Design an enzyme around this catalytic site. Structure first.
Site: not given
Ligand SMILES: Cc1ncc(COP(=O)(O)O)c(CNOCCCN)c1O
Ligand SMILES: Cc1ncc(COP(=O)(O)O)c(CNOCCCN)c1O
Lengths: 405, 409
Positions: A63, A191, A268
């Site tokens: 995402k 997270h 992740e």
């Molecule tokens: C469950 C989960 N795992 C990974 C990520 C990505 O986190 P990052 O490494 O990019 O900070 C998320 C992201 N969740 O929300 C991001 C919102 C940003 N507007 C998870 O939920």
């Protein structure tokens, strides 16, 4: 252009390619915004990850940036993928990734999408509620479930209504209920969040994960999977740097989940892999001078908060405009604002900054624009997304080949 | 009801409303697996809005603000109706022209336009464009020298929900300079436009704005321009669920127009309504895809639905929208209510649609309805997290189609 990749010569960086492209468009009328995406930077981030977190298998959070070139490069590198929806599963599988390299890490999934996962052999899913257990029992009963636990983010805007994550109390009930329904729980995930200020949060989460592991052992589960989530920074332009976080995480992992226990550790990371790999170039398309006699300027550029800069609203981003042409040291600076191309008055990128007087047709650069920018952009007012130019050097391609071997 | 979607239109039988079509579609998928979110768009409601406009503002030719909702079916219906079109970009001009609208029914009402897009407008015969700055005059002189320019003036939009005057609109002082500069460069200025702000709260703003326009018209007469076009913008409400209703605003506008711009003067008056035409025409149905029970013993609930702030409900952030969840079956008076929150499908913790409302206990598979979701919703939605855009089902009754034929003649 999505599968088109350009060669990066020796002794050239992404910044040089950006400059080159700009100077070749000076005569022409057409000056749309565009990205330069260095896939080499993603390989660099992977090497850095393998060094800093050797016990942790990275699962790229699609995402963050669902560009087929990004996912293709990462897939060749051998990372896993965190998918939150059917479309992301389709994307990853269409690039030849097997289901056992996919975790469906969305705690609250539409039944039809759970069914889709089951049909395509994606076994591992997260959950944090009883209703999710019922849906899984009816729609993907042989699934390997990962219990997502809550983490404390003291800096979050909404602290009383957390969207995801089970408390320890609720976790025990969830594990007992999963035993009743004959559903296999194989591990724990959390997270910490992107806006982490203290790495100790990770330690607490790992401790909490251990606690839930013990509960699983009590209920009769064979827990092996620890998912430490994401939130690692994607550039060096942050106070809390990646290696400080990893230096705190590894002793915690050795203490609470030692390798001899047979635990398998994954993460992740989203923004860590891609943030710095993308640089955005926007053109100043309009200009107003407002007298306060102190001159101030309003600059309009051809990307905005409905496009790439939606991260200002959705991702709490702080963007720093950079000048393409280095300014002379004695040049006078002026109080200036920067606005997007749309009619909306809230389409404002920078409220107040100091810039030399610039002109329509001059370029502005924004670094570290890989994460949560294009993935969430819309075509409000009919403005199309900027073209992305992917680049990769020869040695970067060699490194990618080594990973494939 | 199954589609063939852009140009697919369903019949609405006599004695049936959009609400009834919603019920039918919901009851049809009752036992089925797939319960994705969907819209019902009543093109009849758009025709009713046009008839209402013709009655309330008989001197004002409406130019639909495409950016509000750029769905081809809406633009096609409005084009058959004979409205003009306010386009903000090359893509919107392409859309409008692709449906057969001639350029003299298009105003390019973006005051700060990229040179290449001005060039595109000139190449396709779109003559009329707005401006509010000297640099814009330079660009026009270089890229569209035969353009008919409309000077956009600033308005006091302090009470408006979406303020636009901070970004756009020239003061009277600047307007004098812009007109003189336009004379130097041999560019034809033909009128004045303003925008009171989207979501107007005080109709008196229109009066001041109209007065300001008159002054700029007079300024143009001094320098030798023959000003004829008055563009009174948008800001009109799109539903009856508002404090300031359409007809109050028009009751304030019409006397001001008669006073400052009488019909014998030869002025041509247009407007750029966006949300007025489309807001109430779209009703959104979302499915409850997940559920959590939180104990306080007071029970509270968290409902997750399959559209969110990255999709249709981006209007919560960008449009300052206040959304009201509605139940399909209106509840019994003795049914127990609970404090509840509603969340979007994405992993983001900020993807929250409703912080706190009172609802009966609901279940996965139940539907929630949101009315008046036509304006600044689909036009600004993304596919973040891979969640697809809701299906739109267009409906139109037979009498509605007849009314459209009358307008088309
Ligand atoms: C469950 C989960 N795992 C990974 C990520 C990505 O986190 P990052 O490494 O990019 O900070 C998320 C992201 N969740 O929300 C991001 C919102 C940003 N507007 C998870 O939920
Ligand atoms: C120049 C212009 N003309 C019309 C409109 C539409 O006004 P409405 O009738 O929809 O209130 C706009 C709207 N501008 O910004 C709206 C942002 C809403 N989130 C114009 O700018």
């Amino acid at each position: 252009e999505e599968f088109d990749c350009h060669f990066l010569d020796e002794g050239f960086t992404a910044k040089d390619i950006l400059d080159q492209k700009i100077n070749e468009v000076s005569s022409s009328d057409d000056k749309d915004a565009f990205y330069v995406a260095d896939l080499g930077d993603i390989l660099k981030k992977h090497l850095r990850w393998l060094k800093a977190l050797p016990r942790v298998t990275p699962f790229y959070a699609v995402k963050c940036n669902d560009s087929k070139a990004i996912v293709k490069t990462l897939a060749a590198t051998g990372t896993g993928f965190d998918c939150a929806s059917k479309t992301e599963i389709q994307l990853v599988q269409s690039l030849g990734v097997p289901p056992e390299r996919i975790i469906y890490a969305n705690p609250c999934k539409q039944v039809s999408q759970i069914k889709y996962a089951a049909n395509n052999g994606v076994q591992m899913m997260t959950f944090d509620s009883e209703v999710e257990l019922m849906k899984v029992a009816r729609a993907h009963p042989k699934a390997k479930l990962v219990l997502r636990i809550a983490t404390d983010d003291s800096k979050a805007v909404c602290r009383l209504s957390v969207k995801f994550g089970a408390t320890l109390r609720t976790s025990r009930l969830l594990l007992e209920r999963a035993k009743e329904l004959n559903i296999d729980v194989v591990g724990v995930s959390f997270h910490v969040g992107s806006g982490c200020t203290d790495p100790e949060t990770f330690v607490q989460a790992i401790s909490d994960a251990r606690c839930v592991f013990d509960m699983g052992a009590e209920v009769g589960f064979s827990m092996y999977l620890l998912d430490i989530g994401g939130g690692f920074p994607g550039s060096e332009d942050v106070k809390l740097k990646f290696e400080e976080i990893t230096g705190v995480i590894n002793p915690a992992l050795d203490k609470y989940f030692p390798s001899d226990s047979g635990v398998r550790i994954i993460a992740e990371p989203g923004r860590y892999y891609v943030a710095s790999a993308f640089t955005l170039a926007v053109n100043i398309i309009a200009k107003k001078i407002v007298l306060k006699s102190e001159q101030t300027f309003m600059y309009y550029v051809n990307d905005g908060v409905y496009g790439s800069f939606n991260c200002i609203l959705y991702d709490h981003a702080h963007v720093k405009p950079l000048l393409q042409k280095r300014p002379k040291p004695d040049e006078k600076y002026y109080s200036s604002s920067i606005w997007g191309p749309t009619c909306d008055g809230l389409d404002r990128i920078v409220e107040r900054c100091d810039l030399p007087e610039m002109h329509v047709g001059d370029w502005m650069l924004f670094e570290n624009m890989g994460a949560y920018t294009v993935a969430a952009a819309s075509t409000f007012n009919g403005f199309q997304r900027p073209t992305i130019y992917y680049v990769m050097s020869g040695p970067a391609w060699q490194l990618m080949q080594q990973f494939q071997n």
